[PDB]
Design a protein around this ligand. Structure first.
Ligand SMILES: CC1(CN2CCC3(CC2)CN(c2ncnnc2Oc2ccc(F)cc2C(=O)N2[C@@H]4CC[C@H]2COC4)C3)CC1
Length: 464
C-alpha cells in the first residue's frame, strides 16, 4: 500500500513532477525504491522502448505561413496515472510479501538468499542479458527481465518491501551484490557477472584476488539515498544506437542535481562523473562547470575509497581530450594507469580492459593526430611523452604477474604510431624510471632516434 502522502503527488505529467516525487521520497528515512524505480521504468518505457512519436526534425525550409509540421520536432511526456503505477506497485508487493515469522534487527544469510531466490526464479529463462531498458522494477514486473545489476537492485528493493533495513546495495565499478548484517560486513552474491554465476557466495575471494571487479574491498556500500542515486544513474536514454531521448537525459540531469544538492553524491564518484558529462553537453546556468565536478569525483574516490577507483580519472581525461587539452588528458591517463598497476588482471575484468584498449588504441592516437594537425605544442613537450610512457608502464605493471594477458600485437601497432608522433629530439630529453619489467626492457627502444617497430612489437607482446 502506498502512503497517502505519496498518492497526492499523482498524476505525474512532467519531469518536474517526477523530481518532486523523488524530492519527497528522499526526505524520508526510507525512500520507496520500488515506487521510484517503477516510475522511472514506466517513463523510460514510453520514452525509449516504445517511442510514440519519432525524433526526426524536418528539413529547414522557410515560407510566409507556418510549417506543416513542428519544424524542430517534438518532445513529450507519458502521463503517469496513480491507478497505473499503484497497480504495478501492488503487483510487486503482493508478489514479494506472499513469497517470503520464520526469521525474527539483523537479517540472516538464509533470509537474504530466499529473497534473492524469489527475484532470480521469477526471471524469464532466455533473454539477452545486455539489452537496454531492463534495469528497473517496471521491467521486472511487466517483462520478467532484468540486467545483471538490476537483479541486485531488485533484491534490495524486495528486502526493503519486507522491512529488511540492514540489506543494502554494494557496488564496484562494474558489479553489484548485497551487504547486510550488524555493521554491513556480511556479503552475498545475488546476480551473475560478465558476458557468461557465484550466487550465494561471499565476495571474500574476489577481494582477496585483487581483481578490479571487487576493488580490493574499496567498493561502495550504499545507504538508501545512494540506492536512489544508482537507479538515477541507471536511466537509459537510448532510443537506438544513434539517438538519445532528450527527455530522459534532462530527467536524469535534474535528478542528479537534486541528489547532489542533498549531499547524496558525496561518496558516489561515478555519479559525479555522470553529472559532469551531462553538464558538458547541456550546461545548467549557475551550476559548477564540469571540471569542478570531475575533480569532486576524484576527491571522493581518494577520500572514501583509498584512491583505488579507475573511472574518476577516465572521466577527467575524456573531458580534457574532447576539449583538446592534450597535456592534461595525457596526465589524467597516466594517473589512471597508476591506479590499475596495483591490481591483478583477472578473468572478469573485461570491462576496464575494454576501456583501456579504446584509450590506448583509438582515443590517444586521435588526440595525438589532432595535436599534430595544430603543429607550445604538446608533441614538443617531453612531459607529454613521459605521460604517455607512464600510461603504458601502468598497463604493463598491471599485466605483470596477472593470471590473464593484457597486451597483444594490435596494441604494439598503436604504441609505435603514438611514439612516432613525438620527434626523436623530444623523446631523447626524458629520463624516466619504469616500474614494469616490460617497459624497463624496452626503455632504450622508446627514446632511440629511429623507432624499431618490430623490436617494440616483440617486447610489448612478451609473455607476462
Ligand atoms: C569510461 C567512462 C564512462 N563510463 C564510466 C562507467 C559507467 C559507464 C560510463 C558509469 N556507470 C555507473 N554509474 C553509476 N553507478 N554505477 C555505474 O556502473 C555500474 C557499477 C556496478 C554495476 F553492477 C553496474 C554498473 C553499470 O554499468 N551501470 C550503468 C549506469 C549505472 C549502473 C547501472 O546501469 C547501467 C558505469 C569515462 C568514465
Amino acid at each position: 500500500g502506498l502512503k497517502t502522502a505519496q498518492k497526492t503527488l499523482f498524476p505525474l505529467r512532467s519531469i518536474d513532477d517526477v523530481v518532486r516525487l523523488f524530492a519527497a521520497e528522499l526526505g524520508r528515512e526510507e525512500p520507496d525504491l520500488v515506487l521510484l524505480s517503477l516510475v522511472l521504468g514506466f517513463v523510460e518505457h514510453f520514452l525509449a522502448v516504445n517511442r510514440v512519436i519519432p525524433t526526426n526534425v524536418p528539413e529547414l525550409t522557410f515560407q510566409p505561413s507556418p510549417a506543416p509540421d513542428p519544424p524542430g520536432g517534438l518532445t513529450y511526456f507519458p502521463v503517469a496515472d496513480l491507478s497505473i503505477i499503484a497497480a504495478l506497485y501492488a503487483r510487486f508487493t503482493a508478489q514479494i510479501r506472499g513469497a517470503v515469522s520464520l526469521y525474527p534487527g539483523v537479517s540472516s544469510r538464509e533470509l537474504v538468499k530466499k529473497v534473492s531466490d524469489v527475484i532470480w526464479n521469477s526471471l524469464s529463462r532466455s533473454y539477452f542479458k545486455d539489452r537496454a531498458h531492463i534495469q528497473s522494477l517496471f521491467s521486472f514486473i511487466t517483462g520478467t527481465k532484468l540486467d545483471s545489476s538490476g537483479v541486485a537492485f531488485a533484491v534490495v528493493g524486495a528486502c526493503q518491501a519486507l522491512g529488511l533495513r540492514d540489506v543494502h546495495l554494494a557496488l564496484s565499478e562494474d558489479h553489484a551484490w548485497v551487504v547486510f548484517g550488524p555493521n554491513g560486513e556480511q556479503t552475498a552474491e545475488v546476480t551473475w557477472h560478465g558476458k557468461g554465476d557465484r550466487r550465494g557466495q561471499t565476495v571474500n575471494a574476489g577481494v582477496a584476488e585483487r581483481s578490479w571487479l571487487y576493488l580490493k574491498g574499496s567498493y561502495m556500500r550504499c545507504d538508501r539515498k545512494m540506492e536512489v542515486a544508482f537507479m538515477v544513474c541507471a536511466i537509459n536514454p537510448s532510443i537506438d544506437l544513434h539517438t538519445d531521448s532528450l527527455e530522459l537525459l534532462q530527467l536524469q540531469q535534474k535528478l542528479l542535481w537534486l541528489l547532489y544538492d542533498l549531499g547524496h553524491l558525496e561518496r558516489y564518484p561515478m555519479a559525479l562523473g555522470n553529472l559532469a558529462d551531462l553538464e558538458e553537453l547541456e550546461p545548467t546556468p549557475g551550476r559548477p562547470d564540469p571540471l569542478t565536478l570531475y575533480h569532486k569525483g576524484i576527491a571522493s574516490a581518494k577520500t572514501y575509497y583509498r584512491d583505488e577507483h579507475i573511472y574518476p580519472y577516465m572521466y577527467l581525461a575524456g573531458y580534457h581530450c574532447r576539449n583538446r587539452n592534450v597535456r592534461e588528458a595525457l596526465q589524467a591517463w597516466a594517473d589512471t594507469a597508476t591506479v590499475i598497476q596495483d591490481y591483478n588482471y583477472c578473468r572478469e575484468d573485461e570491462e576496464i580492459y575494454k576501456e583501456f584498449f579504446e584509450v590506448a588504441n583509438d582515443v590517444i592516437p586521435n588526440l595525438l593526430k589532432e595535436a599534430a594537425s595544430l603543429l607550445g605544442s604538446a608533441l614538443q613537450d617531453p612531459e607529454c611523452f613521459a605521460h604517455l610512457l607512464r600510461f603504458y608502464d601502468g598497463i604493463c605493471k598491471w599485466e605483470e604477474g596477472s593470471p590473464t594477458p593484457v597486451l597483444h600485437v594490435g596494441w604494439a601497432t598503436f604504441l609505435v604510431q603514438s611514439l612516432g608522433r613525438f620527434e626523436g629530439q623530444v623523446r631523447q630529453k626524458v629520463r624516466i624510471t619504469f616500474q614494469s619489467e616490460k617497459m624497463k626492457g624496452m626503455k632504450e627502444l622508446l627514446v632511440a632516434t629511429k623507432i624499431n617497430s618490430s623490436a617494440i612489437k616483440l617486447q610489448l607482446t612478451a609473455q607476462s
